[PDB]
CSV table of N, CA and C in Angstrom, one decimal:
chain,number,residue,atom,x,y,z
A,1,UNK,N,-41.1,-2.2,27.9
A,1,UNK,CA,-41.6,-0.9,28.3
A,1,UNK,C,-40.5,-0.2,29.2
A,2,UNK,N,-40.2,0.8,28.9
A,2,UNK,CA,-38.9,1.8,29.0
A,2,UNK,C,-38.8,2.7,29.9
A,3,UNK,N,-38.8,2.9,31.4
A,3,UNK,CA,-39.2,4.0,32.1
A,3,UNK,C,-37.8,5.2,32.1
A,4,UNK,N,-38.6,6.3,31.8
A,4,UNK,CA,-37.3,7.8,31.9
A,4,UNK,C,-37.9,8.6,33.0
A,5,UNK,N,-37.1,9.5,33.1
A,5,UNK,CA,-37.3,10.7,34.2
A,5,UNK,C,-38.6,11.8,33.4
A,6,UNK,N,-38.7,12.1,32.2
A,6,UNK,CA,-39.7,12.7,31.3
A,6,UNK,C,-40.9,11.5,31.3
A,7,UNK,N,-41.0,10.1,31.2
A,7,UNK,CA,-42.1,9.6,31.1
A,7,UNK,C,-42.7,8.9,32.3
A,8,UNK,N,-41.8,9.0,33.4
A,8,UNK,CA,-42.2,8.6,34.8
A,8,UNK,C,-43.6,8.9,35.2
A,9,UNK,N,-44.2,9.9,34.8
A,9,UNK,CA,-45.7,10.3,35.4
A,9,UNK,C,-46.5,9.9,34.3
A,10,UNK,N,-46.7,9.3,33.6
A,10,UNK,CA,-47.4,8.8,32.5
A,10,UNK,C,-47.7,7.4,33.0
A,11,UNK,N,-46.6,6.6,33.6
A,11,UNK,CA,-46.5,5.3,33.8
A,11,UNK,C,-46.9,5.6,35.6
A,12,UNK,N,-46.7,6.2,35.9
A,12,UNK,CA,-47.1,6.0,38.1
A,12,UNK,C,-48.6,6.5,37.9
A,13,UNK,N,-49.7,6.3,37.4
A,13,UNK,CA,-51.1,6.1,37.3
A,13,UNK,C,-52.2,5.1,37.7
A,14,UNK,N,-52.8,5.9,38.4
A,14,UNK,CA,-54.0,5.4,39.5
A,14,UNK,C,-54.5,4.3,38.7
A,15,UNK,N,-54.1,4.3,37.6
A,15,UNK,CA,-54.9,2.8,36.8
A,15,UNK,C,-54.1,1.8,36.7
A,16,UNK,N,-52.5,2.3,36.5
A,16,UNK,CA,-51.7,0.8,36.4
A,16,UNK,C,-51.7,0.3,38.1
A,17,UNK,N,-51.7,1.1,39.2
A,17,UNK,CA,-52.0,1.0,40.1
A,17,UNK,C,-52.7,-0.1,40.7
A,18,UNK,N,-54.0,0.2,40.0
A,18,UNK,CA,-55.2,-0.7,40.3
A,18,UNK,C,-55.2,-1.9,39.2
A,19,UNK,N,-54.5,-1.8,38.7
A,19,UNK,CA,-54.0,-3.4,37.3
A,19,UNK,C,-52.9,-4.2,38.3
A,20,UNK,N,-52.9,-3.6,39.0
A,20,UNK,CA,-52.2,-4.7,40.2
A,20,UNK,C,-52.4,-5.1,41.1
A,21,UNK,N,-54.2,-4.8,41.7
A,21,UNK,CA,-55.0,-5.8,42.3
A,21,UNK,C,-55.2,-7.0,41.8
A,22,UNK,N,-55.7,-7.6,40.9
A,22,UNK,CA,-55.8,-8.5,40.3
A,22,UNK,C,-54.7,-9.6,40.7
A,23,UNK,N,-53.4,-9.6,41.3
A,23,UNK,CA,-52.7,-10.2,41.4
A,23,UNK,C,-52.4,-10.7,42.9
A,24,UNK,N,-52.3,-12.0,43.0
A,24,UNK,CA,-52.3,-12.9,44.4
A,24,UNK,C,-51.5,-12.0,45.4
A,25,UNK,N,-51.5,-12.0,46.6
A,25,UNK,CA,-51.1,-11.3,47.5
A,25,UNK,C,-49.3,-11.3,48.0
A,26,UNK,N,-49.1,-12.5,47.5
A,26,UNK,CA,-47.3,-12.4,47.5
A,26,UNK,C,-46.8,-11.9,46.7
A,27,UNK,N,-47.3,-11.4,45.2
A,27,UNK,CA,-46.8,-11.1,44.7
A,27,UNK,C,-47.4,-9.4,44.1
A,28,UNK,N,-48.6,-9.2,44.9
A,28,UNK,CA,-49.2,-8.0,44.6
A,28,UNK,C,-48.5,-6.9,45.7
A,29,UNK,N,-48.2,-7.6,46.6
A,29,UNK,CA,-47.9,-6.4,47.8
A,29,UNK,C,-46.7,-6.1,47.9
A,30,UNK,N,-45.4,-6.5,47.4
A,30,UNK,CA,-44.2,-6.5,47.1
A,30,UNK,C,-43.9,-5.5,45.6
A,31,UNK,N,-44.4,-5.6,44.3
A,31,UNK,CA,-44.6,-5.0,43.3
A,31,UNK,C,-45.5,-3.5,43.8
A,32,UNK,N,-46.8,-3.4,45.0
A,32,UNK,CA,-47.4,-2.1,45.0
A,32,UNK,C,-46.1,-1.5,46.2
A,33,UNK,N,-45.8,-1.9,46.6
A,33,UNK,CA,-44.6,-0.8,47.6
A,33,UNK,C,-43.5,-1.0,46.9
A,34,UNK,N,-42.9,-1.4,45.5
A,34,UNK,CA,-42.4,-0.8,44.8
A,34,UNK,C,-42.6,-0.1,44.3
A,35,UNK,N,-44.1,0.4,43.4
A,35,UNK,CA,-44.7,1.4,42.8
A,35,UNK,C,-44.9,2.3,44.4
A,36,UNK,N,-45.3,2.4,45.2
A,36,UNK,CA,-45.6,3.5,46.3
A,36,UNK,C,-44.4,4.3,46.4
A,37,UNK,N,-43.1,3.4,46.7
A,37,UNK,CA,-41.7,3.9,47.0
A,37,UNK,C,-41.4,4.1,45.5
A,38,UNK,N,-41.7,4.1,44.4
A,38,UNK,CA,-41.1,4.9,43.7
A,38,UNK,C,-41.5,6.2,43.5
A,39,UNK,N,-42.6,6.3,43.7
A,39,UNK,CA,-44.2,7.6,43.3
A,39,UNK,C,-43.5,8.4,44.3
A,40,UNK,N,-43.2,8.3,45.6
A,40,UNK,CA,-43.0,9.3,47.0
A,40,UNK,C,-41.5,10.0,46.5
A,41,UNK,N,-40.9,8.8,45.7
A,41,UNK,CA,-39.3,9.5,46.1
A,41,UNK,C,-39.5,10.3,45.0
A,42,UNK,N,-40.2,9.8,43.8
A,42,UNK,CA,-40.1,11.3,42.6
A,42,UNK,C,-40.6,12.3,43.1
A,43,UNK,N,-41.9,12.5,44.4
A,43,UNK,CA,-42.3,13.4,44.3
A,43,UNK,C,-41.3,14.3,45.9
A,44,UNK,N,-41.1,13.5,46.4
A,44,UNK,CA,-39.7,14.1,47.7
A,44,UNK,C,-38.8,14.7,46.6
A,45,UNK,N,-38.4,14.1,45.3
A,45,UNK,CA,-37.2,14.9,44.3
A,45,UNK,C,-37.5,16.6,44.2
A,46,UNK,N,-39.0,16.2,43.5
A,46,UNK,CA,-39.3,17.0,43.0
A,46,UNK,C,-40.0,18.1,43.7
A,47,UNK,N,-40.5,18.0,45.0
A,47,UNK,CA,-40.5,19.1,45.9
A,47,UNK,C,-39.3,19.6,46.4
A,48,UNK,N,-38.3,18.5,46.5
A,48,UNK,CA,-37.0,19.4,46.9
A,48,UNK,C,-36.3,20.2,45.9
A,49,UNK,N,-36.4,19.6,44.2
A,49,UNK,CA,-35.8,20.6,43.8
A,49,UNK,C,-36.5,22.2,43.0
A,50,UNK,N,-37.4,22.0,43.4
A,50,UNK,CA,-38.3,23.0,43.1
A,50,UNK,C,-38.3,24.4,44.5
A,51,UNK,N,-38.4,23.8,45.6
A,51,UNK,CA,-38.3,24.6,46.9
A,51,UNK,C,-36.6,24.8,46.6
A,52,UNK,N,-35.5,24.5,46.3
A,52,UNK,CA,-34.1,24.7,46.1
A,52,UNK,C,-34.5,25.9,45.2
A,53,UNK,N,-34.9,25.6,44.1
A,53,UNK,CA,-34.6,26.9,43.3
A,53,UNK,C,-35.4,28.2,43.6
A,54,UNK,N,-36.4,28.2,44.5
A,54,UNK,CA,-37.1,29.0,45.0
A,54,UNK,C,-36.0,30.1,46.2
A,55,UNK,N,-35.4,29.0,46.6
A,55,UNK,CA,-34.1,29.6,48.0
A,55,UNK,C,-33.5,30.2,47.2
A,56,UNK,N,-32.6,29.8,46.4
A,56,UNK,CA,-31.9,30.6,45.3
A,56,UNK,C,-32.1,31.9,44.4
A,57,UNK,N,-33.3,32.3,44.2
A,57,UNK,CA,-33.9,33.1,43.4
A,57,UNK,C,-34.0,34.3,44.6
A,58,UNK,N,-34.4,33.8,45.9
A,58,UNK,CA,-34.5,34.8,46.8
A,58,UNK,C,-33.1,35.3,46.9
A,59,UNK,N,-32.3,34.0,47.3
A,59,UNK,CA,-30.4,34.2,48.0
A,59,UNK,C,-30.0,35.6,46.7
A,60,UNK,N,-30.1,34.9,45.2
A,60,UNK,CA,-29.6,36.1,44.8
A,60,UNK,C,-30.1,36.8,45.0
A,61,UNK,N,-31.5,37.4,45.0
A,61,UNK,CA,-32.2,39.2,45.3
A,61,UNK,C,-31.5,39.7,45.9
A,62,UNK,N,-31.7,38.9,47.1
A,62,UNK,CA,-30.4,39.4,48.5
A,62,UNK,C,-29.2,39.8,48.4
A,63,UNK,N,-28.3,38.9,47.8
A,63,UNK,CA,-27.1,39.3,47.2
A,63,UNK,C,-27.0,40.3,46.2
A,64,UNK,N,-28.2,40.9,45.3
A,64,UNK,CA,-28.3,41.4,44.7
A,64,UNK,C,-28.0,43.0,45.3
A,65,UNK,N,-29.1,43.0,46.7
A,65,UNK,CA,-29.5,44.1,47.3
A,65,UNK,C,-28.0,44.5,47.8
A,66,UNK,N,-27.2,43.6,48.2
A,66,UNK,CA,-26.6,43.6,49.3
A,66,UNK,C,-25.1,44.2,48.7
A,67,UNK,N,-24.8,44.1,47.4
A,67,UNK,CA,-24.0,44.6,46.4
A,67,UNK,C,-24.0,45.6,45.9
A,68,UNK,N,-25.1,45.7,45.7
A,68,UNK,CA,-25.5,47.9,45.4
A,68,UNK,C,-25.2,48.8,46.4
A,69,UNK,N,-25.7,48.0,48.0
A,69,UNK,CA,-25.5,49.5,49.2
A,69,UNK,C,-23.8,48.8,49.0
A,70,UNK,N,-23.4,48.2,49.7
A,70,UNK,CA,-21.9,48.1,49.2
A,70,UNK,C,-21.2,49.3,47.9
A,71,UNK,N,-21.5,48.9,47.1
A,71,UNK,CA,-21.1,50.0,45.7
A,71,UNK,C,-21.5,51.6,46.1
A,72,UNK,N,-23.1,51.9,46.9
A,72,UNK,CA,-22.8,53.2,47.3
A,72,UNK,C,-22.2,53.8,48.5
A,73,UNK,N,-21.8,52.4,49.3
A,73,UNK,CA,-20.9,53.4,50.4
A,73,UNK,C,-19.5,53.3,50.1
A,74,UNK,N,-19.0,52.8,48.9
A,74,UNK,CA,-17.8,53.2,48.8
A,74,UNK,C,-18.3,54.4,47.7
A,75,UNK,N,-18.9,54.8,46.9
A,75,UNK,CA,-18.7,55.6,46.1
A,75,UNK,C,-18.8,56.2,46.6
A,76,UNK,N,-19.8,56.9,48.3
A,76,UNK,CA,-19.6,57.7,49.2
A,76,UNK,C,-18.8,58.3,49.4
A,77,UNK,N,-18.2,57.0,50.2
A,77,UNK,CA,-16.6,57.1,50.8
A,77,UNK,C,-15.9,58.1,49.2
A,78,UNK,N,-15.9,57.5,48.2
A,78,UNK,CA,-15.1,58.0,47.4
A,78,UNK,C,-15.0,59.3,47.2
A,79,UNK,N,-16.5,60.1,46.9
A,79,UNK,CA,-16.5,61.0,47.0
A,79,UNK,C,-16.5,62.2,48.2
A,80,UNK,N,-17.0,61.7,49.1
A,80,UNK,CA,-16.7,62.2,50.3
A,80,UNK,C,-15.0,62.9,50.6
A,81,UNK,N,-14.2,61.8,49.9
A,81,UNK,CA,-12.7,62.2,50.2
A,81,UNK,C,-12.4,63.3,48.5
A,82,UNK,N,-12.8,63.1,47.6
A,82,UNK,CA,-12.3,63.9,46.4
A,82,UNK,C,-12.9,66.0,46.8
A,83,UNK,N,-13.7,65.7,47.5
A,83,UNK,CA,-14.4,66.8,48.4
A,83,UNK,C,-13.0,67.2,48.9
A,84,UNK,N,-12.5,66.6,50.0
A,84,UNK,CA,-11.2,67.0,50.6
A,84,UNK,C,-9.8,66.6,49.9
A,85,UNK,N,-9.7,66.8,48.8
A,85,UNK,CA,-8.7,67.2,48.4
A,85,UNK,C,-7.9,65.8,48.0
A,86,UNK,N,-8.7,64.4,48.0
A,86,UNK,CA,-7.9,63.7,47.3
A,86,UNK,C,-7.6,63.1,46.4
A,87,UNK,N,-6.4,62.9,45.7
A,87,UNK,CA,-6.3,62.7,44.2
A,87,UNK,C,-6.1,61.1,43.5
A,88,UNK,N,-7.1,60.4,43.3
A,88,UNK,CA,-7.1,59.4,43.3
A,88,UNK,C,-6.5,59.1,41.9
B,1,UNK,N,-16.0,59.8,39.4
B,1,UNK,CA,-15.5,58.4,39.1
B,1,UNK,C,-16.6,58.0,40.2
B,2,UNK,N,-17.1,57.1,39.0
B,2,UNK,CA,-18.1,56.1,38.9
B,2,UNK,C,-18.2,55.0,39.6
B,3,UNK,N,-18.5,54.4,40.3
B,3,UNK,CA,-18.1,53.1,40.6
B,3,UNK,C,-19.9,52.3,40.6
B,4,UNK,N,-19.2,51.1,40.0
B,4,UNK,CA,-19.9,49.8,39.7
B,4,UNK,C,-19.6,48.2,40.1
B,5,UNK,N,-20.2,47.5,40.4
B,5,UNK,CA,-19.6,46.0,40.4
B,5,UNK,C,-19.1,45.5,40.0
B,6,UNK,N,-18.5,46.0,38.7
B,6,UNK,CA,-17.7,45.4,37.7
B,6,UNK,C,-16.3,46.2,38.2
B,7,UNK,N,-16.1,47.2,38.8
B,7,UNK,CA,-15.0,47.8,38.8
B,7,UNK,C,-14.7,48.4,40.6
B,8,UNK,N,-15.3,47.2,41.1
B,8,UNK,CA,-15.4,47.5,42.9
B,8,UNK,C,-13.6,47.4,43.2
B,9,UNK,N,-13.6,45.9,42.8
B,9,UNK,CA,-12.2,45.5,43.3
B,9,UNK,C,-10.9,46.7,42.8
B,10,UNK,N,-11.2,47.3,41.8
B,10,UNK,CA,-9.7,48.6,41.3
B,10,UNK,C,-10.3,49.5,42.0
B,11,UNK,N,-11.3,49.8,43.1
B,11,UNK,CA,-11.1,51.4,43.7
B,11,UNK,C,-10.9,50.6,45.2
B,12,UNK,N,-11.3,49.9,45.2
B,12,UNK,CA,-11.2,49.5,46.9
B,12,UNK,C,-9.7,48.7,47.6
B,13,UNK,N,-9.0,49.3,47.1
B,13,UNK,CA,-7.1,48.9,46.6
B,13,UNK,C,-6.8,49.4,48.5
B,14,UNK,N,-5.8,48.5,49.1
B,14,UNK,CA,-4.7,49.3,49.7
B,14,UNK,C,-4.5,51.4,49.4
B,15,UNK,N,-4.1,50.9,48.4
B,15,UNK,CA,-3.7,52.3,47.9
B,15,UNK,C,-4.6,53.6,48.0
B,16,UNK,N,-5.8,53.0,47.8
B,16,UNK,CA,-7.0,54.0,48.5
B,16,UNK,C,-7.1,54.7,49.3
B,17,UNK,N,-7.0,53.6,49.8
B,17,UNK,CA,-7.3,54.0,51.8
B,17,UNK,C,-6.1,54.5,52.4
B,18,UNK,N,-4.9,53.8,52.2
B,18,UNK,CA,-3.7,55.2,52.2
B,18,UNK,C,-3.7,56.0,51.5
B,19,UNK,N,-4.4,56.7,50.8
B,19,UNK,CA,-4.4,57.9,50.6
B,19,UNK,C,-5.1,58.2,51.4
B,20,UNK,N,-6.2,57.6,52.2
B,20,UNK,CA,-7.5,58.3,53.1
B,20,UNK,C,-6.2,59.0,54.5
B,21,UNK,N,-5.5,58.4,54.7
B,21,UNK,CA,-4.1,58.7,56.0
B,21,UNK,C,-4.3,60.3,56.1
B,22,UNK,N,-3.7,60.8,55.1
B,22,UNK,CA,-3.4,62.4,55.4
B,22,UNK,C,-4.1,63.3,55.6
B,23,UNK,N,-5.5,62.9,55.6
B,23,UNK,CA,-7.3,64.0,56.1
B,23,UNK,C,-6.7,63.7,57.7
B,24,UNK,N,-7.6,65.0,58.1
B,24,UNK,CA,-7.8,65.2,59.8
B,24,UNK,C,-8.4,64.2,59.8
B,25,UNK,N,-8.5,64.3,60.7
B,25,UNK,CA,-9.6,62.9,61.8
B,25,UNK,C,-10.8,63.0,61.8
B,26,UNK,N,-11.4,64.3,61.7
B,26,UNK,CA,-13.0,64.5,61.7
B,26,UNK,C,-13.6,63.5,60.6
B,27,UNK,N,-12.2,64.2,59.3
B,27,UNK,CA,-13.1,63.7,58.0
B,27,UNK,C,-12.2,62.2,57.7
B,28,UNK,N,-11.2,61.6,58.3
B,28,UNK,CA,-10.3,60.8,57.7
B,28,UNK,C,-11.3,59.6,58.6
B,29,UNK,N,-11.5,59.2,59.8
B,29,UNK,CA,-12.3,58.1,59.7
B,29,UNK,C,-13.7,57.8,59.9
B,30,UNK,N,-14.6,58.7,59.2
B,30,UNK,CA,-16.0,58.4,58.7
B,30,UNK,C,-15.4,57.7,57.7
B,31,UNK,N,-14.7,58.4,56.9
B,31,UNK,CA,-14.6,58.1,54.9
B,31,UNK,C,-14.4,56.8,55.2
B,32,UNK,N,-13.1,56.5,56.4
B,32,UNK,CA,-12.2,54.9,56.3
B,32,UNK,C,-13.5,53.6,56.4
B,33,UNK,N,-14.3,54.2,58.1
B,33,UNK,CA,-15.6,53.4,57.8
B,33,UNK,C,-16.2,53.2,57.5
B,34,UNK,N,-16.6,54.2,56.0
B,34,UNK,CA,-17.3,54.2,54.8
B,34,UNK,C,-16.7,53.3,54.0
B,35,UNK,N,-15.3,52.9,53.9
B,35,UNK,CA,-14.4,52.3,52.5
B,35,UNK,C,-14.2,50.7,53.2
B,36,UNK,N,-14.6,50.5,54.9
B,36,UNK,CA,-14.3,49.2,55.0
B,36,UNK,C,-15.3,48.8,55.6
B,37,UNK,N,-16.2,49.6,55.6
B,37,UNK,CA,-17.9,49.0,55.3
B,37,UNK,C,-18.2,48.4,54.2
B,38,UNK,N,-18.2,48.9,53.0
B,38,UNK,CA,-18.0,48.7,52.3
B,38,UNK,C,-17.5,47.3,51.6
B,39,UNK,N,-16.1,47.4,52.1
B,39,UNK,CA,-15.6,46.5,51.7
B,39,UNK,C,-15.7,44.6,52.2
B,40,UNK,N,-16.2,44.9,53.7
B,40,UNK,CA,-16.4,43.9,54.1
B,40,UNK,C,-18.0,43.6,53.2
B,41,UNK,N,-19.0,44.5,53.1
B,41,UNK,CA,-20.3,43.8,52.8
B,41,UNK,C,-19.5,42.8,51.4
B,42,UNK,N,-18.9,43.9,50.7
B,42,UNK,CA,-19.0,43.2,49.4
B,42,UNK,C,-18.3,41.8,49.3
B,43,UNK,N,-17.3,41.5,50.7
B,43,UNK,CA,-17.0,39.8,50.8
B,43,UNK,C,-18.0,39.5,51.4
B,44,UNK,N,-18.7,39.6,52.3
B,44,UNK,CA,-19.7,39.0,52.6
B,44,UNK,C,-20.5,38.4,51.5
B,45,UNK,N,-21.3,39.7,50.6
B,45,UNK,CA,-21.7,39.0,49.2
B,45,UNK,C,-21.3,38.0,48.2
B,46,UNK,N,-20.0,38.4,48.1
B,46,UNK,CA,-19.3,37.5,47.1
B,46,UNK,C,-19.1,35.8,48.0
B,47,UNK,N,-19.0,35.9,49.3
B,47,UNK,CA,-18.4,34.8,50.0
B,47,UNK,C,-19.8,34.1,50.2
B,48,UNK,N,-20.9,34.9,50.1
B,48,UNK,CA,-22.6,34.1,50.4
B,48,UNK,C,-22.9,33.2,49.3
B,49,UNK,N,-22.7,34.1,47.8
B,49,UNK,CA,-23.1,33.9,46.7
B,49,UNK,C,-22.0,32.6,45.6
B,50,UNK,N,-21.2,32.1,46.2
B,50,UNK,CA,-20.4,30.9,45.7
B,50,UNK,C,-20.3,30.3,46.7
B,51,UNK,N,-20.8,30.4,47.7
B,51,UNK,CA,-21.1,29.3,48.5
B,51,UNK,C,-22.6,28.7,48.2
B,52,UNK,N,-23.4,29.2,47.8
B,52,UNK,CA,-24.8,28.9,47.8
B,52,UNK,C,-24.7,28.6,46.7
B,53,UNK,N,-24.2,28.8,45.4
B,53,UNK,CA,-23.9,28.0,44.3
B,53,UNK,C,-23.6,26.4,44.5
B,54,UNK,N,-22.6,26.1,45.7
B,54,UNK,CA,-21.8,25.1,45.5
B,54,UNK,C,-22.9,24.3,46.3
B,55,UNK,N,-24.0,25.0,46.9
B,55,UNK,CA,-24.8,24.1,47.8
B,55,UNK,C,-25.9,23.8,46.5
B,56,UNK,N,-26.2,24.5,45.5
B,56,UNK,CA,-27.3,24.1,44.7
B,56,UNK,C,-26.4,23.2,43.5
B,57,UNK,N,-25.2,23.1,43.2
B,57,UNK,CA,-24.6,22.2,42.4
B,57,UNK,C,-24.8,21.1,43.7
B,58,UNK,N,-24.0,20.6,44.7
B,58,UNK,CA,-24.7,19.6,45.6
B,58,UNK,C,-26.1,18.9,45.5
B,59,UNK,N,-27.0,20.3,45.5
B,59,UNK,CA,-28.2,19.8,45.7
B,59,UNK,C,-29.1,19.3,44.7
B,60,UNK,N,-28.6,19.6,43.3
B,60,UNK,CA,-28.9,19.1,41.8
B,60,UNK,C,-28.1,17.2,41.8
B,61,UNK,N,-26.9,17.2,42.1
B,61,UNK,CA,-26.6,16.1,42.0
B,61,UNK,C,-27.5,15.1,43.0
B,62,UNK,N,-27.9,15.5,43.9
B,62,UNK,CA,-28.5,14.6,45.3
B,62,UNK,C,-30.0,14.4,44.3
B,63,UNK,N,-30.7,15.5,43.8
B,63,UNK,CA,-31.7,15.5,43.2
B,63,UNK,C,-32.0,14.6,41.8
B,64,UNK,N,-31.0,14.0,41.3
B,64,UNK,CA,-30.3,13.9,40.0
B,64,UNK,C,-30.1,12.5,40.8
B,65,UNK,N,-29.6,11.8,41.9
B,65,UNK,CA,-29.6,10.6,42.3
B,65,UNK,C,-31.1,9.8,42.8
B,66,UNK,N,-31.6,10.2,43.3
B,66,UNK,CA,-33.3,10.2,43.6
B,66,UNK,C,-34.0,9.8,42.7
B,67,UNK,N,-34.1,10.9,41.6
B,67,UNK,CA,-34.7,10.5,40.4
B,67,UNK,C,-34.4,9.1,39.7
B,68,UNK,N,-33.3,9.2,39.2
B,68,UNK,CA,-33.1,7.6,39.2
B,68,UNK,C,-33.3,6.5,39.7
B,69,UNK,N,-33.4,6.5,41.0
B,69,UNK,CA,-33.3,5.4,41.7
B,69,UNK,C,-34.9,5.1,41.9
B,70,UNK,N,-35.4,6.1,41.6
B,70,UNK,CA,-37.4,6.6,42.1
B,70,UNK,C,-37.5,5.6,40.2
B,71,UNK,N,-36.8,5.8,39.4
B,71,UNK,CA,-37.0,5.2,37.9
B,71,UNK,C,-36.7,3.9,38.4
B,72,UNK,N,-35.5,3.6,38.4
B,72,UNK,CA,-35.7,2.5,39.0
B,72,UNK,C,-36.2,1.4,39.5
B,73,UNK,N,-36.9,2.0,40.3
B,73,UNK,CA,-38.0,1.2,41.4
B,73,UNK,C,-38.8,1.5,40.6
B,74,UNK,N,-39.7,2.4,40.0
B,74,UNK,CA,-40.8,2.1,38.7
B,74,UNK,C,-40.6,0.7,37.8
B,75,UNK,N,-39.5,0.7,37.3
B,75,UNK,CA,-39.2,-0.3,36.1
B,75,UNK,C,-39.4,-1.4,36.7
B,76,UNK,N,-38.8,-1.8,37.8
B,76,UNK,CA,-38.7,-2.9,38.6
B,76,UNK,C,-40.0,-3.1,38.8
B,77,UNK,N,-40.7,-2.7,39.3
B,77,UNK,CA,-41.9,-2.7,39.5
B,77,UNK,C,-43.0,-2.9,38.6
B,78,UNK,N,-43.0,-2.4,37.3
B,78,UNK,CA,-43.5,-2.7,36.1
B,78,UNK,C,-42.8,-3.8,35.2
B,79,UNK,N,-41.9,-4.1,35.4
B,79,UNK,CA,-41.1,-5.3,35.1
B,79,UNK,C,-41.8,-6.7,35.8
B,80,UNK,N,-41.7,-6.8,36.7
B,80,UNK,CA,-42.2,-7.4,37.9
B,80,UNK,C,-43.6,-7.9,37.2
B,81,UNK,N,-44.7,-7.0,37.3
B,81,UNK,CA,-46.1,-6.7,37.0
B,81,UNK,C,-46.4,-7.8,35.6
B,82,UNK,N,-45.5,-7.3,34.5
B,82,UNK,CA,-45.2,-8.2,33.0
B,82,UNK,C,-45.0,-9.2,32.9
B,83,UNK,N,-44.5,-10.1,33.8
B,83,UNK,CA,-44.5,-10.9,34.2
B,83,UNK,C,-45.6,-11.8,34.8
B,84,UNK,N,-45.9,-11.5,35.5
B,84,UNK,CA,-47.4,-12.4,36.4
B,84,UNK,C,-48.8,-11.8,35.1
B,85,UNK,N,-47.9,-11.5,34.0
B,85,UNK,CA,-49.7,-11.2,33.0
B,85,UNK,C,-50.1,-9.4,32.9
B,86,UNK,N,-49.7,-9.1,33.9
B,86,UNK,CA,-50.6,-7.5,33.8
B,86,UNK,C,-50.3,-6.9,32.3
B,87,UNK,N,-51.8,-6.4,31.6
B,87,UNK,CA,-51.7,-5.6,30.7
B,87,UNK,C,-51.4,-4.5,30.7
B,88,UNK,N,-50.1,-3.5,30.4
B,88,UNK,CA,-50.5,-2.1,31.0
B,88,UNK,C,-50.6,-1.7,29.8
């Protein structure tokens, strides 16, 4: 049995979970904080990269905004000066 | 004459802004702090927006190491399990 990044949540289930009570205590509590510590770190992955692209989607707006007033104060500026006489 | 994002960097030239030199003063440095207002937002933007790139390529590879290692410690774990009998 094959674990992937696509079938990881199929296999980290409250029921294989509990298919590992059954098993003596040296060998049950070493195997469940390997399934705990794997379950946390996919889901630390996956909140981090989910809040990442969330920052990003804002960063560009921003950059978005922030490129247009740019583009009209020079076209300002631009025209401001062809007003006075100059020949670009 | 139009200006756009695509065509910031050919108006906002040296050459520009000496031409802005030979206006009086009343009108010669608004226009100039119009044309390096300007100019500075748009590094600012461009210098924000490839740097936050290079922090979300960083933060996909960090994301991209996690996941694995979170597989990993699943397999191991369900490996582990197959062993001592568990049916999953």
């Amino acid at each position: 049995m094959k674990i992937t990044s696509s079938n990881f949540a199929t296999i980290a289930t409250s029921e294989n979970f509990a298919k590992l009570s059954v098993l003596p205590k040296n060998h049950r509590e070493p195997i469940k904080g390997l399934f705990k510590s794997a379950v946390e770190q996919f889901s630390s992955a996956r909140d981090f990269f989910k809040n990442e692209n969330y920052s990003k989607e804002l960063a560009e707006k921003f950059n978005k905004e922030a490129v247009n007033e740019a583009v009209e104060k020079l076209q300002k500026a631009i025209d401001l000066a062809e007003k006075q006489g100059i020949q670009f």
